[PDB]
Structures are given as C-alpha cells and as structure tokens.
Ligand binder design. Structure first.
Ligand SMILES: [Ca+2]
Length: 240
C-alpha cells in the first residue's frame, strides 16, 4: 500500500497474509480475506505459481511476533474456471482456498462480511484498501499492516479513455487514482473494505495496478468485484 497509515491491530480482522515456502522460511506474497473458518478468498493470479502456500490469520507485523498469529496450510485451491493468467483484464481474478484446519475466531480473526450479489457502489464511495504490499512503486513490503483511504471510481469514469478504458470491466471495482495512495505489489488478493449502511463489507479483491506504477493519477487500483461472485463463492463452498 502506497500512501497508507499503519492499521490498528483489530481494525481489519478478516485480512490474511498468503505466504509461500522459500528455503527454510516463508515469504508474504499476497493478501486474502477470511470468509469461513476454513476458507479464504484471494486473487486467482496469487496462486498461478505452483508453490507451497500457507495462510496466516491474526497477523499484524510480518517481521515480529504479535502473539495473535495462527498458521494454517492450504489444502485445496479453487480458481475461478474462467480465469486466464495471460488476460487479467478479462476479469475472473478470484480464488478460494480451503484451509487444512479451521481457524479460531477472536478480536484479531473474524470472517469478512461480503456484499449482497449485484451491489454496485456509487461513485466516490468511502473505502479502505489494506495490506502489506510495497509502500512505494518498486519499493519494499510493509512490516506492519497498512491501510489507505481509496474512494471508488465508478465504471463509467473508470472505463473512460483517460482512466483505464476497455481494460476495466463491470465485474471490477476501481478505487483511488489520486496519484498518492494506492494498492501495490503484494496487496493483491486482499480486501477493499467499503462502508455501507454503517458496516464495512469486503467489496473488492485486489487485482491490478498500472504497469507504469502503483500510485499513478487516473490509474486507480482495480479490484475483482466481490458482489459479482457471490453465487460462485457459495457454490464452491457448498460443493467442497
Ligand atoms: Ca507477526
């Protein structure tokens, strides 16, 4: 997250860190949202590589013991069937991970609330992106969980020529674009949390930013629209 501030430890309890095994250690690669005690929602592109993945819930500082972490293996990966790794702009950048154990819920570990199917946010709706992604274009991952205030940019503006054009689909949510604050690499798969009728809900799954840079004016961060996948999500969970 570029232009973020450190999250309070209990603000975003559904945020997870998706990590892969490297050497005798683990490396953060992406975010995720805990949606059942044994299921995480993330970006399809986060799991294209044939790596060994684990999920950390109750995580705050990737580089320090917080006393609140639970570590769990990924047992099964269900990528959206229409996902095409060579075409992120086509959409479908979503995957569900079934965890090897059910995590224990507490003030640091909670299920993310999802919007009802079809819900679209009005332009300029208040949201926060959260993650441990790069804090600058071509930068380094955050140690502590970051948040940034990123208001939505509706489909009509986002898909206009000076923004993202035909690259953005109605199955996505755009947010930010101010040139200061944005998602960045390593935020992929994580939540966009938007305040609606008094409650935060996870309306986006971080998908992409410009090849030019993370915080580029009129290239808001783009997210898979969660409310386009409610039926898909339920179908997967019910069959697995
Ligand atoms: Ca930690």
């Amino acid at each position: 997250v570029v232009g973020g501030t450190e999250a309070q430890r209990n603000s975003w309890p559904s945020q997870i860190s998706l990590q892969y095994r490297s050497g005798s250690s683990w490396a953060h690669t992406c975010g995720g949202t805990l949606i059942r005690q044994n299921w995480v929602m993330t970006a399809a592109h986060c799991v294209d590589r044939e790596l060994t993945f684990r999920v950390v819930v109750g995580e705050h500082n990737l580089n320090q013991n917080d006393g609140t972490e639970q570590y769990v293996g990924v047992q099964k990966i269900v990528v959206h069937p229409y996902w095409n790794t060579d075409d992120v702009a086509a959409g479908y950048d979503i995957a569900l991970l079934r965890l090897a154990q059910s995590v224990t819920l507490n003030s640091y570990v909670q299920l993310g609330v999802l919007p009802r199917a079809g819900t679209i946010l009005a332009n300029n709706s208040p949201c926060y992106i959260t993650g441990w992604g790069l804090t600058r274009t071509n930068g380094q991952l955050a140690q502590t969980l970051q948040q940034a205030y990123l208001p939505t940019v509706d489909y009509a503006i986002c898909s206009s020529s000076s923004y993202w054009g035909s690259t953005v689909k109605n199955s996505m949510v755009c947010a930010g674009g101010d040139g200061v604050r944005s998602g960045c690499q390593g935020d992929s798969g994580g939540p966009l949390h938007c305040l609606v009728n008094g409650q935060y809900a996870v309306h986006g799954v971080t998908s992409f930013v410009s090849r030019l840079g993370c915080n580029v004016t009129r290239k808001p961060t783009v997210f898979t629209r969660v409310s386009a996948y409610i039926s898909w999500i339920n179908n997967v969970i019910a069959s697995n």
